[PDB]
RNA sequence: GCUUGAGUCUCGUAGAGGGGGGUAGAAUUCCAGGUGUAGCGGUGAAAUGCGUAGAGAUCUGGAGGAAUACCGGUGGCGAAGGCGGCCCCCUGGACGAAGACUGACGCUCAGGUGCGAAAGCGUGGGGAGCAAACAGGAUUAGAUACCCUGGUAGUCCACGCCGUAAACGAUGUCGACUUGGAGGUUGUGCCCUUGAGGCGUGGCUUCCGGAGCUAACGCGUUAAGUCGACCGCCUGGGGAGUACGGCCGCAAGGUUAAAACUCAAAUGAAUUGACGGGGGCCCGCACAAGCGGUGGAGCAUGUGGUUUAAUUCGAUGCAACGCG
């Protein structure tokens, strides 16, 4: 989101975009309402997060 | 002509095409340029190169307004957008704000099915 | 090249001008293992090139070859990629020699002397090959 | 009679448990208007489609419907199906702490009754998105598909029906006993709290494992271990959960449920290999980078075929075809 111009800068290099929206949240809402694949995608995501 | 001196660069990167619209702070468009209207139809209109030449071409065609400052508003994902704002400060603009204004529903409408490719 | 990174073998320089560049040019021109014939053609053709352009020998050659060196060259993508210098002048010589074999003059020394002379003011066939390569890599610039 | 089973009362706790009502913010679509101009959309690539009657982009105002990002978690609640913004109203259960009370009031359950995703059906609304059917464009040998552009029922609400699912921990309910470890979640007591305290005691739950069991795989105090009570169901594969009959249902169909005939297997788990348009690593003139050929011409020679009295026999993907 917003980043004001600095007094002495060439590149703003805002990381605001990365910490939230671009990578996951919009690519997720491109495709189908299931209820079913998310229960198993989250099941195997939390079953993969193991030592 | 009309000498606005500050605007907003609405860049609308999608997966297939980036479309850059330079406007004023009221929201009235002053001139636009798409990646698909700069040659390279098809698999090549969704690249960072096509977006940057789209932004170069949208920096042209607003010379009649004397824009020096502009905010950048970014929609959608895309191979564009990042390169796009680069082309803007390669065209003498003082880039002030970079907001990302991608529309995110708060679980609204059902998205389409697709793609068993 | 699957595994083996390689060295390279050292060519003897030219017996008239000491130029390994021109030595590789007589190797590009040589057919059927006949090197004497090819160096005769190169000495005659570049000798009339030095007489025609009036510059000198291998700076007339180096200008005429400087106008034909490619800059960059090209799902099925044709990506543009930057040419290495040894490959750069290797392609230069291959295009000069090939275009000189295409010409319709009398002797090979006249075909290649006229091809290097047509490349000195960059209007020959090898410059059309270089402009063709550069149109392919210029059209497809969108892949890097 | 008695309290160790079951239940009642007191006080709290956590919770997407249920039903009714209201509201909020993002976003999609549509409508009206401003700017603005040549494309937009889409794909592996395209085209159909939308667009100089001004689209797409962008700003303002409005309408409407559905769903409720982040929190969000092998987190929670529910008998199961299932339940996710926030607020109110009505309401069910669970768990914990101390004490009091009843006093075996318990467990299971054929028939019976209730609840029961989704799709579907009936009547009446609603209809933004999505989308069976359908239409067009592609792809293809074909493409009644996958992909693209549209798109109706439906999905949403009220009431009634249906009555099923891989309705699944493929594991009936209730109770007892039998080594451990790491967590999560929700109670609570005690003790310098003198941290990111310590020490205990319950409820639910996740992962790994011991004995034991198991065909093996695995289960493993939430058992598939060791027992008890009651219920449901099984008896080779197919035919067949089908036909006939009954009951139910508006219908779709649901439920109960055969036989003739036919096969000598069908099946489970695991092993070795092979294979994969599975994954990782690696090689070879394998590809790439090049140079010269073959396929075109004439001839040489071998072969197939044809011919012949015979055209001797053998070699025939690679690895037969100037081969024996």
UniProtKB/Swiss-Prot annotation, chain B:
Gene Ontology cellular-component annotations: cytoplasm; cytosol; cytosolic small ribosomal subunit
SUPFAM superfamilies: Translational machinery components
GO molecular function list: small ribosomal subunit rRNA binding; structural constituent of ribosome
Record has Ion transport as a keyword: no
UniProt keyword RNA-binding present: yes
Alphabetized InterPro entries for the sequence: Ribosomal_uS11, Ribosomal_uS11_bac-type, Ribosomal_uS11_CS, Ribosomal_uS11_sf
Keywords: Methylation, Ribonucleoprotein, Ribosomal protein, RNA-binding, rRNA-binding
Pfam families, per the entry: Ribosomal_S11
Top-level taxon: Bacteria
UniProt GO BP: cytoplasmic translation; translation
Role: Located on the platform of the 30S subunit, it bridges several disparate RNA helices of the 16S rRNA. Forms part of the Shine-Dalgarno cleft in the 70S ribosome.
Family: Belongs to the universal ribosomal protein uS11 family.
Quaternary assembly: Part of the 30S ribosomal subunit. Interacts with proteins uS7 and bS18. Cross-links to IF-3. In stalled ribosomes contacts ribosome rescue factor SmrB.
Miscellaneous comment text of the record: Has been predicted to contact the N-terminal domain of IF-3 based on footprint studies; exactly how IF-3 interacts with the 30S subunit is controversial.
UniProt-recorded name of the protein: Small ribosomal subunit protein uS11
UniProtKB/Swiss-Prot annotation, chain C:
GO-annotated cellular components: cytoplasm; cytosol; cytosolic small ribosomal subunit; membrane; ribosome
Domain of life: Bacteria
Effect the entry attributes to changing residue 35 to A/E: Defective in ribosome assembly
GO biological process, one term: ribosomal small subunit assembly
Described purpose of this protein according to its UniProt entry: One of the primary rRNA binding proteins, it binds directly to 16S rRNA where it nucleates assembly of the head domain of the 30S subunit. Is located at the subunit interface close to the decoding center, where it has been shown to contact mRNA. Has been shown to contact tRNA in both the P and E sites; it probably blocks exit of the E site tRNA.
Miscellaneous comment: The strain K12 sequence is shown.
Family: Belongs to the universal ribosomal protein uS7 family.
Protein name: Small ribosomal subunit protein uS7
Gene: rpsG
Segment of the intact protein contained: 2 to 152 of 179
């Amino acid at each position: 989101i917003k980043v004001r111009e600095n007094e002495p800068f060439d590149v703003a290099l805002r990381r605001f975009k990365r910490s939230c929206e671009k990578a996951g949240v919009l690519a997720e809402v491109r495709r189908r309402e299931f209820y079913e694949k998310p229960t198993t995608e989250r099941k195997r995501a939390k079953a993969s997060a193991v030592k | 002509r009309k000498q606005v001196s500050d605007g907003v660069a609405h860049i609308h990167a999608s997966f297939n095409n980036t479309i850059v619209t330079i406007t004023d702070r009221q929201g009235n468009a002053l001139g636009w340029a798409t990646a698909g209207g700069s040659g390279f139809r098809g698999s090549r209109k969704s690249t960072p190169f096509a977006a940057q030449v789209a932004a170069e071409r949208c920096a042209d065609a607003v010379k009649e307004y004397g824009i020096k400052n502009l905010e950048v508003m970014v929609k959608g994902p895309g191979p564009g957008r990042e390169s796009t704002i680069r082309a803007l400060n390669a065209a003498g603009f003082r880039i002030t704000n970079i907001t990302d204004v991608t529309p995110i529903p708060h679980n609204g409408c059902r998205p389409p099915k697709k793609r068993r490719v | 090249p699957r595994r083996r990174v390689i060295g390279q073998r050292k060519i003897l320089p030219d017996p008239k001008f000491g130029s390994e560049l021109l030595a590789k040019f007589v190797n590009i021109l040589m057919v059927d293992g006949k090197k004497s014939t090819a160096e005769s053609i190169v000495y005659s053709a570049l000798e009339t090139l030095a007489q025609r352009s009036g510059k000198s020998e291998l700076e007339a050659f180096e200008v005429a070859l400087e106008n034909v060196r490619p800059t960059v060259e090209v799902s099925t993508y044709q990506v543009p990629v930057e040419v290495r210098p040894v490959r750069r002048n290797a392609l230069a010589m291959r295009w000069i020699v090939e275009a000189a074999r295409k010409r319709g003059d009398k002797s090979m020394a006249l075909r290649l002397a006229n091809e290097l002379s047509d490349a000195a003011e960059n209007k020959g066939t090898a410059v059309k090959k270089r402009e063709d390569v550069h149109r392919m890599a210029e059209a497809n610039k969108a892949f890097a």
